[PDB]
Ligand SMILES: NCCCNCCCCCB(O)O
């Protein structure tokens with residue numbers, strides 16, 4: 219087929235937390251280093267293309283998307299947590315409930331809650347460094363496409379699409395897709411589209427660009443009435459101000475198969491075609507998989523070949539940022555199938 | 565003289581886990597709290613002890629929303645039916661920039677209705693919250709019908725609960741429910757004074773736009789402690805309620821000699837308000853040995869607190885809130901009542 223380059227960090231376990239709050243218990247996290255190891259091993263076994271390590275871009279490009287206070291918090295959170303004498307990993311306990319003030323406090327517990335949307339995303343040693351590397355993985359891929367590649371695969375871990383300008387959660391810290399999209403904008407690309415095919419709503423990407431018409435954000439996902447993130451992702455969220463009609467949410471119910479999901483994909487592709495962007499960022503999750511342990515769609519591994527083919531037909535410079543997908547048995551087959559279908563396999 | 569209302573049903577709330585510092589720990593708000601106070605009440609022969617009357621959900625719903633009362637009744641069953649294996653703890657909530665919109669899934673509802681993940685729900689939590697509100701309402705009834713004061717030995721506590729938010733070990737706001745009951749019975753003005761170490765954010769929120777119920781709280785600086793996002797001194801009310809909320813904040817290590825200066829400020833605000841009845845949300849987590857709080861009151865200081873409260877000369881309902889050193893919790897709480905009665 220064709221060839222696609224993949225950017226990856228060799229330190230798969232830089233982020234290495236051991237707890238995630240789930241169903242009232244502290245379990246082993248779903249977003250585990252073996253996710254990245256397994257995808258990388260399938261990239262190599264399939265000879266998808268060249269594999270390279272990220273360039274360091276520093277925090278400059280990260281701060282085009284995230285606030286300075288938030289970027290500082292994530293760097294110091296673990297140290298401050300340990301210094302306050304807590305014995306577990308860093309998990310929020312308290313937050314800005316409805317009727318309370320969106321006011322940044324001093325105490326580390328208060329700041330953890332202020333900056334989070336969920337308690338599923340433990341922070342420990344290495345988390346800051348891992349988030350930085352994953353952002354650099356996305357920016358290296360963006361650089362590859364800007365300098366001539368049709369597409370590149372940013373093997374991001376941790377993922378990013380739930381991260382707001384200053385809110386972390388859903389296993390995400392820095393919004394890698396939004397950082398790559400904004401990097402395209404900063405490099406003179408007039409219009410960028412961000413298409414979120416992870417099972418969950420990309421609420422962070424929607425929020426970051428919500429009042430802007432230069433970045434079109436679209437997400438297909440399970441009904442937030444039923445699943446995370448619960449409080450964004452509904453189809454009536456179409457943008458605000460100049461961003462009115464430049465956000466599109468497409469929602470599906472439990473057990474949705476490719477035959478139906480692909481109708482939503484076609485709707486998203488039509489919206490992209492009318493927008494006529496200059497580059498495309500695909501926030502790629504394969505938690506739409508029929509065996510994914512926390513999601514309820516029914517795509518088969520062969521469906522990811524079809525997804526990649528349909529994405530290529532859009533005809534755009536394309537960066538893929540890796541998001542979710544938690545059946546590690548099949549994560550490599552599924553994610554690399556998208557790249558292979560984009561490159562002509564099917 | 566002073567009567568105490570106590571429900572043995574409080575023990576139906578007996579959770580095994582509390583999220584604290586990233587770990588699931590033995591909960592601080594444990595059944596021995598109410599039992600140790602009750603044993604001191606009997607040992608000191610403070611007064612008659614009675615069980616609550618059943619007032620139904622009506623008076624509860626004068627303060628809390630109907631959806632929220634409904635949620636608390638079914639939350640545990642819904643949680644078990646969705647296949648969760650632990651106790652019921654919220655994982656996701658309305659983060660900043662998200663919609664305050666009620667979803668269908670149990671996880672989404674838990675987050676919508678909560679302000680923290682420290683308050684696990686399990687079987688019997690609903691029953692105990694109901695009985696605790698009836699304890700407060702029975703104490704209010706005793707006062708309204710002639711008693712100078714009454715002790716509502718509530719467990720679980722209430723002062724962190726908003727009209728439709730739970731957290732901080734609280735589900736129904738027992739103090740607010742008794743306050744609203746005074747108002748519904750023709751008491752023109754009511755004051756609620758919160759001496760628990762933490763801010764009574766639930767009580768503040770419930771009456772925040774009202775001038776007929778004056779809410780005052782002394783507490784540790786929320787920049788430093790729970791509940792973090794309310795309780796600052798610039799929160800004075802809104803609409804008709806501006807100047808009818810007063811927060812008095814203190815830093816770590818504050819002793820009674822300083823804390824009681826804030827108490828005097830509170831009492832003068834009450835004196836000028838001139839209420840027809842007073843509700844005291846009584847926590848003894850201001851105690852020098854409290855495991856989660858940073859004030860330095862002594863057991864003897866609680867006698868001084870109770871005496872000062874009596875000098876306000878008002879019909880007074882005490883609702884039990886916090887206090888987590890179980891060794892001294894009985895001595896401390898009953899010291900307030902005894903200092904009130906003249907000890
Ligand atoms: N395990 C809890 C169910 C919902 N939580 C999912 C975590 C964040 C979404 C993951 B993703 O790939 O967007």
Ligand SMILES: NCCCNCCCCCB(O)O
Nearest residue numbers: 732762790847856885886887
């Ligand atoms: N344990 C960590 C501090 C925050 N948790 C306290 C919750 C409120 C209970 C205290 B009460 O008596 O008002």
Ligand SMILES: [K+]
Nearest residue numbers: 414416418438
């Ligand atoms: K999505």
Ligand SMILES: [K+]
Nearest residue numbers: 427430433464
């Ligand atoms: K937009």
Ligand SMILES: [K+]
Nearest residue numbers: 758760762782
């Ligand atoms: K207080």
Ligand SMILES: [K+]
Nearest residue numbers: 771774777808
């Ligand atoms: K008020």
Ligand SMILES: [Mg+2]
Nearest residue numbers: 325327328788
């Ligand atoms: Mg703290």
Ligand SMILES: [Mg+2]
Nearest residue numbers: 509545547548
């Ligand atoms: Mg399998």
Ligand SMILES: [Mg+2]
Nearest residue numbers: 444445669671
């Ligand atoms: Mg759920």
Ligand SMILES: [Zn+2]
Nearest residue numbers: 416417418542
């Ligand atoms: Zn996902």
Ligand SMILES: [Zn+2]
Nearest residue numbers: 760761762886
């Ligand atoms: Zn307290």
